[PDB]
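Researcher: Going back to the complex we discussed earlier. I've cleaned up the inputs and rechecked each line, so this should be the final set. Can you rerun the prediction on the complete assembly and write out the structure?
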Amino acid sequence: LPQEAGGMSELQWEQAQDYLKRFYLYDSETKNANSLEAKLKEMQKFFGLPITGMLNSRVIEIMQKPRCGVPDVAEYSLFPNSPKWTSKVVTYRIVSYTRDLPHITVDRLVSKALNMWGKEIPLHFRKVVWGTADIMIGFARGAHGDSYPFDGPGNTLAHAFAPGTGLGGDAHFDEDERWTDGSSLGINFLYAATHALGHSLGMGHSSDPNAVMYPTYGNGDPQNFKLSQDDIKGIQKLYGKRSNSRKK
Ligand SMILES: CCCCCCCCCCCCCC(=O)OC[C@H](COP(=O)(O)OCC[N+](C)(C)C)OC(=O)CCCCCCCCCCCCC
Ligand SMILES: CCCCCCCCCCCCCC(=O)OC[C@H](COP(=O)(O)OCC[N+](C)(C)C)OC(=O)CCCCCCCCCCCCC
Ligand SMILES: CCCCCCCCCCCCCC(=O)OC[C@H](COP(=O)(O)OCC[N+](C)(C)C)OC(=O)CCCCCCCCCCCCC
Ligand SMILES: CCCCCCCCCCCCCC(=O)OC[C@H](COP(=O)(O)OCC[N+](C)(C)C)OC(=O)CCCCCCCCCCCCC
Ligand SMILES: CCCCCCCCCCCCCC(=O)OC[C@H](COP(=O)(O)OCC[N+](C)(C)C)OC(=O)CCCCCCCCCCCCC
Ligand SMILES: CCCCCCCCCCCCCC(=O)OC[C@H](COP(=O)(O)OCC[N+](C)(C)C)OC(=O)CCCCCCCCCCCCC
Ligand SMILES: CCCCCCCCCCCCCC(=O)OC[C@H](COP(=O)(O)OCC[N+](C)(C)C)OC(=O)CCCCCCCCCCCCC
Ligand SMILES: CCCCCCCCCCCCCC(=O)OC[C@H](COP(=O)(O)OCC[N+](C)(C)C)OC(=O)CCCCCCCCCCCCC
Ligand SMILES: CCCCCCCCCCCCCC(=O)OC[C@H](COP(=O)(O)OCC[N+](C)(C)C)OC(=O)CCCCCCCCCCCCC
Ligand SMILES: CCCCCCCCCCCCCC(=O)OC[C@H](COP(=O)(O)OCC[N+](C)(C)C)OC(=O)CCCCCCCCCCCCC
Ligand SMILES: CCCCCCCCCCCCCC(=O)OC[C@H](COP(=O)(O)OCC[N+](C)(C)C)OC(=O)CCCCCCCCCCCCC
Ligand SMILES: CCCCCCCCCCCCCC(=O)OC[C@H](COP(=O)(O)OCC[N+](C)(C)C)OC(=O)CCCCCCCCCCCCC
Ligand SMILES: CCCCCCCCCCCCCC(=O)OC[C@H](COP(=O)(O)OCC[N+](C)(C)C)OC(=O)CCCCCCCCCCCCC
Ligand SMILES: CC(C)CCC[C@H](C)[C@H]1CC[C@H]2[C@@H]3CC=C4C[C@@H](OS(=O)(=O)O)CC[C@]4(C)[C@H]3CC[C@]12C
Ligand SMILES: [Ca+2]
Ligand SMILES: [Ca+2]
Ligand SMILES: [Zn+2]
Ligand SMILES: [Zn+2]
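Model: Rerun complete. Updated structure for the full complex:
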C-alpha cells in the first residue's frame, strides 16, 4: 500500500524479523514478538530515519523490495569491529560476474563506483589482474554455504563483510538477480556497487532525499550522478570529528 504502516499485517511483521535476521546471521533479540517490537525502533535507524518509534516513511513498504543485502551496521564474529582499511592503497578485481551481462560491463561499473568514493577519502583503489585483490567482488547463488539463501530473483540481493586482511572488504552479489546499467531490465548496479562498497567505509542511510544512499527514493534518477553535501559529510565523519549536521 502507498501507506503500508497502518495496513501492516502478519506479512510485514515477519519481513522485519526476516530482514534483521539476515544481517546479524541470527540475533536472539530479533526473535520474539515483544522483543522485536523494540528492535523495530532500532531497524528504523538503519533506514536513516530520525524518528525511532513511529512508522510514517515508506520503510515497511520498501523493505520487501531487494534494496539491502549488505549489513548497514556490522556485527561479525571472529574479529574486532572496525570499518577501516589499514593501507593507503587498496585493490579490486571482479572475480565472478552476472552472466546476463558480459564481463566488460560488470568490471568497469565497479571502477566508477570506487572512484566516486575514491576522491574524497585518503585511499586509492588500483585495479589488479594477477591473482586475488583486496576487495573481491563476486556473483553467486545462495547455495554456497553461507547463512540464508539470496532467494533467486527478488527479495535480497547480496552479502558482504567489513575490511579485514583476507576475509574482509569483499562482497558476494546475487547472480540470479537481474542487474543493469542503462538498460533498465535490472536493478542499477552503479548505485548498488556504490551502496555496497560504501558500508566498507562505515557509512549509513541518509534522511536527505538529495543523498546517494536514501532508501525511500522516488521518481527522478540522478542524470550526471554525483555525491551531495550529506554524502561528502558522511566521509568527513570518518576522517574528521563526528557530528550530525542534519537540521530541520
Ligand atoms: C621511482 C624512483 C625510485 C625507484 C626505486 C623505488 C623502489 C621501491 C622499493 C620498495 C617497493 C614496494 C613498496 C611498497 O610496497 O609500498 C607500499 C605502499 C603501500 O603501503 P601501505 O600498506 O599503504 O602502508 C602500510 C601500512 N600498513 C602496514 C599498516 C598496512 O605503496 C604502494 O602500495 C603503491 C605502489 C605500488 C608499486 C607497484 C609496482 C609499480 C611498478 C610499476 C612499473 C611497471 C613498469 C614501468
Ligand atoms: C601478468 C598480469 C596480467 C595478466 C593478463 C593475462 C593473464 C592471462 C592468463 C594468465 C594465467 C592466468 C591464470 C588465472 O588465474 O587466470 C584466472 C584469471 C582470474 O582470476 P580471478 O578472476 O580471480 O579467477 C576467479 C575464479 N577462480 C577463483 C575460480 C579461479 O583470469 C585471467 O587473469 C585471464 C584474463 C583475461 C583478460 C585479461 C585482459 C587484460 C587487459 C586487456 C586490455 C584490453 C584493452 C582494450
Ligand atoms: C572492428 C569494427 C567492429 C564494429 C562493431 C560495430 C558495432 C557492432 C555491434 C555488435 C553487437 C553484437 C551483439 C551481441 O550479440 O552481443 C552478445 C554479447 C554481448 O552482450 P551485450 O549485448 O553487451 O549485452 C546484452 C545484455 N542482455 C543479455 C541483458 C541483453 O556477447 C557475446 O555473447 C559474446 C561475444 C560475441 C561476439 C560478437 C561479435 C562478432 C559478431 C559477428 C560474428 C561473425 C562471424 C562471421
Ligand atoms: C586511433 C584509433 C582509435 C580507434 C578506436 C578505438 C579502438 C580500441 C577501443 C577500445 C574499446 C573502446 C570502446 C569500449 O569501451 O566499448 C565498451 C562497450 C560498453 O562499455 P560501456 O561502459 O557500456 O560503454 C562505455 C562508454 N560509455 C559509458 C561512455 C557509453 O562494450 C560493448 O558494448 C561490447 C558488447 C558486446 C561484446 C561483449 C564481450 C566482448 C568481448 C571481447 C571481444 C574481443 C575484443 C578484442
Ligand atoms: C591515446 C588514448 C586515446 C583515448 C581517447 C579517449 C580519451 C578519453 C576521453 C574521455 C574518456 C572518458 C573520461 C572518463 O573519465 O571516464 C570515466 C568513466 C566514467 O565515469 P562515470 O562515473 O560514468 O562518470 C564520472 C563522473 N561522475 C562521478 C561525476 C559522474 O569511468 C571508466 O570508464 C572506468 C575505467 C576503467 C578502466 C579499466 C582499466 C583500468 C586500469 C587497469 C590498469 C592495470 C595495471 C596496468
Ligand atoms: C599496459 C598498461 C600500461 C599502464 C600505463 C599507465 C599510465 C598511468 C599514469 C597514471 C598518471 C596518474 C596521474 C594522477 O595523479 O592522476 C590522478 C589525479 C586525480 O586523482 P583524484 O581523482 O583526485 O584522486 C586523488 C587521490 N585520492 C584517491 C587518494 C584521494 O589527476 C589529476 O589531478 C589530473 C587529471 C588530468 C586528466 C587525467 C585523465 C582523465 C581521463 C583519463 C583517460 C584515459 C585514456 C586512456
Ligand atoms: C608507469 C606509471 C608512471 C607514472 C606513475 C605515477 C604515479 C601514479 C599514482 C599516483 C598517485 C596519486 C594520485 C592518485 O591516487 O590518483 C588516483 C586516481 C583515482 O584513484 P581512485 O580515486 O581510487 O579511482 C580508482 C579507479 N581507477 C584506479 C581506475 C582510476 O587515478 C586516476 O584518476 C586515473 C586517471 C587516468 C590516468 C590515465 C591513465 C591512462 C591509462 C591508459 C591505459 C591504456 C593501456 C593500454
Ligand atoms: C584508443 C583506445 C584506448 C583504450 C583504452 C582501454 C583501456 C585498456 C586497459 C588495459 C588494462 C586493463 C586491465 C583490466 O582491468 O582488465 C579488465 C578486464 C578483465 O579484468 P580481469 O580481472 O582479468 O577480468 C577477470 C578475468 N576474466 C576476464 C577471465 C573474467 O579486461 C577484459 O575483460 C578483457 C577485454 C577484451 C580484451 C581482448 C583482447 C584479445 C587480444 C587477442 C589477441 C591475443 C594475441 C594472439
Ligand atoms: C628486473 C627483475 C624483474 C623482472 C620482471 C619481473 C616482473 C614481475 C611482475 C609480476 C606480476 C605478477 C605478480 C603476482 O605475484 O601475481 C601472482 C598471481 C598469483 O600469485 P599467488 O601465489 O596466488 O599470490 C601471490 C602473492 N602473495 C603470496 C603475496 C599472495 O599470479 C596469477 O594470478 C597469474 C599467474 C600467471 C601469470 C602469467 C604472466 C605472464 C603471462 C604470459 C602470457 C600469458 C600466457 C597464457
Ligand atoms: C614475456 C612477458 C612476460 C610478462 C612480463 C611482465 C613484465 C612486467 C614488468 C612490469 C611489472 C608490472 C607488474 C607489477 O606491478 O608487478 C608488481 C607485483 C605486485 O604489484 P601490486 O600492485 O603490489 O600487486 C598487488 C596485489 N595484491 C593486492 C594481491 C597484493 O609484484 C609482486 O607481487 C612481487 C614480484 C614477483 C615477481 C618477481 C620477479 C623476480 C624475477 C627474478 C629472476 C631471477 C633469475 C635468477
Ligand atoms: C561521420 C559521423 C561522425 C559522427 C560523430 C558522432 C560523435 C559523437 C560524440 C559524442 C561524445 C559524447 C560524450 C560521451 O562520452 O558520450 C558517451 C555516451 C554516454 O555515456 P553514458 O551516458 O555513461 O552512457 C551510458 C549508457 N547509455 C547511453 C546506454 C545510457 O555514449 C553513448 O550514449 C553511446 C556512444 C555513441 C557514439 C556515437 C558515435 C560512434 C562513433 C562514430 C565515429 C565516427 C568517426 C567518423
Ligand atoms: C580542448 C579542451 C577539451 C575540454 C573538454 C572538457 C570536457 C568536460 C566533460 C566533463 C563531463 C561532462 C559530463 C556532462 O555531460 O555533464 C552534463 C551537464 C548536466 O547534464 P544533466 O542535466 O545532469 O544530464 C546529464 C546526462 N546527459 C549528459 C547524458 C544528458 O550539462 C550541463 O550542466 C550543461 C552544460 C551547458 C553548456 C553551455 C555552454 C557552456 C560554455 C561552452 C563553451 C564552449 C566553447 C567551445
Ligand atoms: C548526424 C549524425 C549525428 C550523430 C549523433 C551520434 C550521437 C551523439 C550523442 C552521443 C551521446 C552523447 C551523450 C552524452 O551527453 O554523454 C555525456 C557524457 C556523460 O554525461 P554525464 O552527465 O556524466 O552522464 C553520466 C552517466 N550517466 C548518464 C550514465 C549517469 O560525457 C562524458 O562522459 C564526458 C566525455 C569527455 C570527458 C573528458 C575528460 C578529460 C578532459 C580533458 C581532455 C584534454 C584533451 C586534450
Ligand atoms: C575472423 C572470423 C572468422 C572470426 C571472428 C571472431 C569474432 C571476433 C568473435 C565471434 C565469436 C566471439 C566469441 C564468442 C564467445 C565469447 C564469450 C564472451 O563472454 S562474456 O560473458 O564476456 O559475454 C567473451 C568473448 C568471446 C570469447 C568471443 C570473442 C570474439 C569472437 C571470437
Ligand atoms: Ca534475490
Ligand atoms: Ca578481502
Ligand atoms: Zn544499507
Ligand atoms: Zn558468500
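Model: Worth noting: Residues 91, 128, 131-134 surround PX4 (ligand 10) (CB under 6 Å).
Researcher: Good, that matches what I expected from the previous run.
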